[PDB]
């Protein structure tokens, strides 16, 4: 019967950028992950909670679908326990992440002919963010002893700089879309279940 709204996540027009990653709370629906895992479109389908094949057998309280664009070198940082500016200042998974990371080369549309600049990532933050935090804040960065009272100045960086995405870039400087399916069981009864 009714299939979960995966089309509105994986098949959308404009994804979030990694500092401001979108979340959709998939629940009260049947989740046909066989549509996903059989797709020739994906580069990466790393499942950490369970083996990818068994996803159509399981049921969960909710499946949070976290969506964002990152560089083709940075997709790796999305795995749990990874280190690096995406894993530490933008989108962090917990050590026991019970979910799947799915990613595809999206240079087809996320790249503009003279370069695209719409996607921002946080290069700087006073501390690593905690698992599944998101930090929208544009507050000027304190990169120097001098207090950044002025809007801009020495060591008063914008904690967010923009990607360089161009069609002729290498695999690595290309805009990989990522979605992270964080499956979750709680006291609440199970709703999102594979099809029969």
């Amino acid at each position, epitope marked *: 019967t009714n299939l979960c709204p995966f089309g509105e996540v994986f098949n959308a027009t404009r994804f979030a950028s990694v500092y401001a990653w979108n979340r959709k709370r998939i629940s009260n629906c049947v989740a046909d992950y066989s549509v996903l895992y059989n797709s020739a479109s994906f580069s990466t389908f790393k499942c950490y909670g369970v083996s990818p094949t068994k996803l159509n057998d399981l049921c969960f309280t909710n499946v949070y679908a976290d969506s964002f664009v990152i560089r083709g070198d940075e997709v790796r940082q999305i795995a749990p326990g990874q280190t690096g500016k995406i894993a530490d200042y933008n989108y962090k998974l917990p050590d026991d992440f019970t979910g799947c990371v799915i990613a595809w080369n999206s240079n087809n549309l996320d790249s503009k002919v003279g370069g695209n600049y719409n996607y921002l990532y946080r290069l700087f933050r*006073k501390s690593n963010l905690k698992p599944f935090e998101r930090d929208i804040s544009t507050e000027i960065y*304190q*990169a*120097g*002893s*001098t*207090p950044c*009272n002025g809007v801009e*100045g*020495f*060591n008063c*960086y914008f904690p967010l700089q923009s990607y360089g995405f161009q069609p002729t870039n290498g695999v690595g400087y290309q805009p990989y879309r990522v979605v992270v399916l964080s499956f979750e069981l709680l006291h609440a009864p199970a709703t999102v279940c594979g099809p029969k």
Partner: antibody, heavy 119, light 106 residues
Framework: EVQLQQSGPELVKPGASVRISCKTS????????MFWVKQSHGQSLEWIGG????????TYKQNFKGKATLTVDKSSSTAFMELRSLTSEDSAVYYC????????????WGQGTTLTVSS | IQMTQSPSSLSASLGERVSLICRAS??????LSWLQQKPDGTIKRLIY???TLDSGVPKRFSGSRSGSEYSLTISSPESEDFADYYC?????????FGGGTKLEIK
């Protein structure tokens, strides 16, 4: 061990330029900013300016901006100051320093390069 | 803009109390550091922030934001402590310093 190894005492006749290094160690070089100070024999110390090496960013005292030039090389992990038009104004003990926001501010310094422009 | 260190030179016996001041014309929001300079070239930080020190600072000498004035005060002199002292205004670029104050035996 933190050590701002720097260049030894130096002399050139006036109307010229000079090379001054400050090697740094005991930390990852791009995790801290670099600044500079000019202290004369008969005058107090003054801030020349600073080149955060990681972002290749540079700020100066307006007075020295027209005669200083700060640089780094990442592979050498070393700071480098160039001074031009060495006049009767251009002689002091010159000093390198490193900084950050989390408490490590203008703490450790280089030995003190006594640039002399006399003949 | 720079702040003014009250004295140029100050003299003492061993054991005498020593107060060193760097008064302010405009509020630097409590951003300031103290440095000591040996006449033979040794520079090292004493104090930063508001009465805060780190690394290895001689004994426990600390000052305070005395309203419009910034300060250093010490519970003893020492043979090495008899040298020149400076306040740095890292409150805003360009960084500025006080003229320095020299601490001496009688």
């Amino acid at each position: 061990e933190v050590q701002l190894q720097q260049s030894g005492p130096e002399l050139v006749k006036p109307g010229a330029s000079v090379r001054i290094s400050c090697k740094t160690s005991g930390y990852t070089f791009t995790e801290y900013s670099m600044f500079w100070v000019k202290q004369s024999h008969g005058q107090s110390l003054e801030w020349i300016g600073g080149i955060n090496p990681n972002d290749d960013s540079t700020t100066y005292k307006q007075n020295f901006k027209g005669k200083a030039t700060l640089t780094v090389d990442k592979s050498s992990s070393t700071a480098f100051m160039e001074l031009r038009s060495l006049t009767s104004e251009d002689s002091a003990v010159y000093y390198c320093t490193r900084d950050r926001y989390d408490g490590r501010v203008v703490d450790f310094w280089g030995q003190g390069t006594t640039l002399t422009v006399s003949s | 803009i720079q702040m003014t260190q009250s004295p140029s030179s100050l003299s003492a016996s061993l054991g005498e109390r020593v107060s060193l001041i760097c008064r302010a014309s405009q509020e630097i929001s409590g951003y300031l550091s103290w440095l000591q300079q040996k006449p033979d070239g040794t520079i090292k930080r004493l104090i930063y922030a508001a009465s805060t020190l780190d690394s290895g600072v001689p004994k426990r000498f600390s000052g305070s934001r005395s309203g419009s004035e910034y300060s250093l005060t010490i519970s003893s002199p020492e043979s090495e402590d008899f040298a020149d002292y400076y306040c740095l205004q890292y409150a805003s670029y360009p960084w500025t310093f006080g003229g320095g104050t020299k601490l001496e035996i009688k």
